Structure formats: C-alpha cells, structure tokens
C-alpha cells in the first residue's frame with residue numbers, strides 16, 4: 001500500500017538506489033537522481049535507464065523539489081570539505097563543495113509542505129564532527145526528526161573490504177527497535193575475483209621496483225582489501241590494495257624486487273563493483289569510458305552491503 005518515492009541527491013552511479021533495491025525492504029520505489037557529473041550520470045542512465053537531473057543543487061528551488069512529490073531523501077554529499085585540515089580551521093562550513101547540502105537543509109526542508117518521512121545520509125567519519133553536520137543535525141531536530149547515526153565498515157558484516165563510513169538515519173517516527181547488524185553470507189576475496197583478467201591490469205615492473213613496498217598486497221584468502229578511492233591505479237598509497245594470485249595469504253617481503261614474480265595486478269573496475277555490492281548485472285563498463293573514469297566513480301561510491309542493512313533499519317517503521 002504505502003510507497004517510497006526517493007530523491008537521490010548526488011546520485012553518482014546509483015549506490016544509494018542499489019542499496020535499497022538489494023535490501024529486504026521489498027517496497028517498490030521510484031528514484032529521481034540529481035547529479036552534475038556527466039560521466040557518473042552516463043553510468044547511472046546506462047544501468048537504470050532513467051535520466052539524471054543536472055540542476056545544480058546549490059540553487060535548486062523549493063518548487064522544483066516539491067513538484068517531484070517525493071517522500072524520501074537519499075544522499076551522500078561531497079566529502080572533500082571534511083578533513084581535519086579544513087575542519088580545524090573552521091573552513092568546512094564555508095567550503096563551496098558543502099554549499100549544496102547546506103542549501104537542501106537550510107533553504108528547502110524547513111519550508112516543504114510535506115517533509116520527507118525518511119532521510120539517509122552517507123559520508124566520511126569526520127563529517128560527524130563537521131560544523132556542516134552540526135547545523136544539519138540542529139535543523140533536522142528543529143523540524144521534528146528522530147536521528148540515529150553509526151560509524152561502521154563492511155568488514156563488520158563480513159565483507160572483505162575496509163571502508164569505514166558515517167551514516168545518518170533520520171525520520172519523523174521514533175525508532176522502537178535497537179539497530180542491528182547481521183553477518184553477510186560468508187565470503188572471501190576469492191568470491192569477487194574475475195577469472196581471466198587481461199595482463200593490462202598487472203603492475204608494471206618499473207613501478208614495482210620503485211614503490212612496490214608501499215602497496216598493500218592481498219591474496220585470495222587474506223582478511224580484507226583496503227578502501228578503494230578515486231585515484232586507484234593512479235596513486236599508489238591509500239587508494240586501494242592490489243592482488244597476488246600466487247599466494248592465498250600474501251607473505252611479506254623485504255625488498256621491492258622480491259615482488260617482481262608474484263603476478264601482482266590491480267583489481268579491475270568490475271571487481272570493485274562486486275566488492276561494493278552492486279548487482280551482478282550492474283556495470284561501470286559503459287562504452288567509451290576508460291578504466292580510470294570507472295575507478296574514479298567507483299572510488300567515490302559506497303558499500304551497498306552496509307547501506308542495505310542500515311536502510312532496512314531506517315524503514316523499519318513501514319512494516320508490521
């Protein structure tokens with residue numbers, strides 16, 4: 001009977017939508033994605049066969065938003081403004097990349113005839129401490145919202161990937177039940193690997209000899225993979241782990257040259273896509289898009305696995 005109509009702000013490649021669709025909420029829903037990134041939109045449209053609204057969220061009018069007649073807000077705002085450097089200088093609140101998310105809560109939400117009955121926000125841990133969210137929290141509270149938040153990682157529910165993120169769950173009804181995480185069907189890094197990767201993905205020997213020791217290396221059996229970020233395969237450190245197909249448990253070495261013969265390679269875009277929990281039919285392999293472009297979008301996406309469970313909680317007032 002009841003329906004879920006979502007405005008997918010900062011839709012990107014449709015991580016928030018994917019999360020909902022794979023969850024057990026099982027209420028048919030509609031999605032209206034907003035994003036100015038042409039490449040990201042192309043992937044979204046390719047997979048969801050729906051057009052992305054490119055209206056800039058910095059200045060979008062209340063009227064246009066309300067014309068959508070939606071009752072749900074999904075969003076993962078730009079995360080750049082939220083590091084210790086910017087935040088310790090109190091510059092996050094004035095950061096132009098935060099202008100869109102402040103606009104939505106300052107200028108839109110408090111004036112809607114029908115406030116969204118459910119709101120889901122995803123961002124980096126430091127967002128929780130930002131002046132931006134501090135204000136958003138106050139606004140939500142003043143507008144009669146109940147708010148539950150959590151900082152967690154996919155590994156917490158048995159997914160072999162470290163991506164610690166901050167999640168905000170807001171709605172107009174109080175939460176009767178304690179939030180709960182369930183362990184996902186057991187899986188290893190093995191389960192996400194493509195089985196015939198082109199050699200164009202293996203780490204060049206010259207790169208190995210110069211920065212090989214900086215890589216976080218994993219085998220098909222190792223505990224987890226590191227957080228995949230935008231610049232994966234471009235910048236060595238902190239952008240994601242690489243894979244060794246020779247050892248179930250990568251055994252560390254002392255010299256870079258010792259890595260030369262372990263057939264090291266980057267994870268493919270399709271592999272990251274599977275690790276982030278997108279549907280088997282979902283693909284960033286849009287015609288014309290290079291691996292870099294796909295890596296960038298994927299690096300900026302989400303863990304559909306985690307969000308699926310948190311959304312089921314957010315919407316637990318729609319059952320029984």
Ligand SMILES: Nc1ncnc2c1ncn2[C@@H]1O[C@H](CSCC[C@H](N)C(=O)O)[C@@H](O)[C@H]1O
Pocket residue numbers: 010011012013014015016034035036037040055056057058076077078100297300301302
């Ligand atoms: N003023 C603005 N209007 C619309 N989108 C914006 C924007 N400023 C930044 N963005 C978008 O917000 C997105 C943040 S990344 C989030 C991606 C999404 N969660 C996914 O699963 O892929 C970026 O793609 C960026 O294009």
